[PDB]
C-alpha cells in the first residue's frame, strides 16, 4: 500500500488538492440543476397528463 502511495504521489502542497473539491462541486452543481429542471418539466407534464385524463 505504502509502495503504491509513494509511487503515485505528486510533489505539491496537500491543501491544494483538497481545495479541488470546490471546483468539482461547482462543476457538479450545473448537472444537478439540469436534473432539477428536467425532473420538474417531467412533473409538470405529468400533472397535465392527470389534468386532461
Amino acid at each position: 500500500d505504502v509502495d503504491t502511495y509513494l509511487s503515485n504521489l505528486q510533489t505539491k502542497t496537500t491543501l491544494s488538492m483538497i481545495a479541488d473539491g470546490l471546483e468539482r462541486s461547482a462543476r457538479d452543481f450545473d448537472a444537478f440543476l439540469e436534473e432539477n429542471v428536467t425532473l420538474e418539466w417531467e412533473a409538470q407534464r405529468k400533472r397535465i397528463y392527470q389534468h386532461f385524463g
Partner: protein, 45 residues
C-alpha cells in the same frame, strides 16, 4: 608504462565529464517533470 595509464585516467575523466552533464540534464528534466506533476495534482485537487 607510467606514461600509458595517463591516457586511461584522463579518459575516465573525459568520460565522467559528460556523465555529470547527463546528471545535470536528468536533474533539469526532473525539475521540468515535477513542475508538471504539481499542475496535474493542482487540477486533480
Amino acid at each position: 608504462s607510467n606514461a600509458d595509464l595517463i591516457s586511461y585516467f584522463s579518459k575516465t575523466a573525459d568520460e565522467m565529464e559528460e556523465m555529470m552533464k547527463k546528471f545535470e540534464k536528468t536533474i533539469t528534466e526532473i525539475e521540468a517533470h515535477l513542475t508538471g506533476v504539481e499542475a496535474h495534482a493542482m487540477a486533480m485537487q
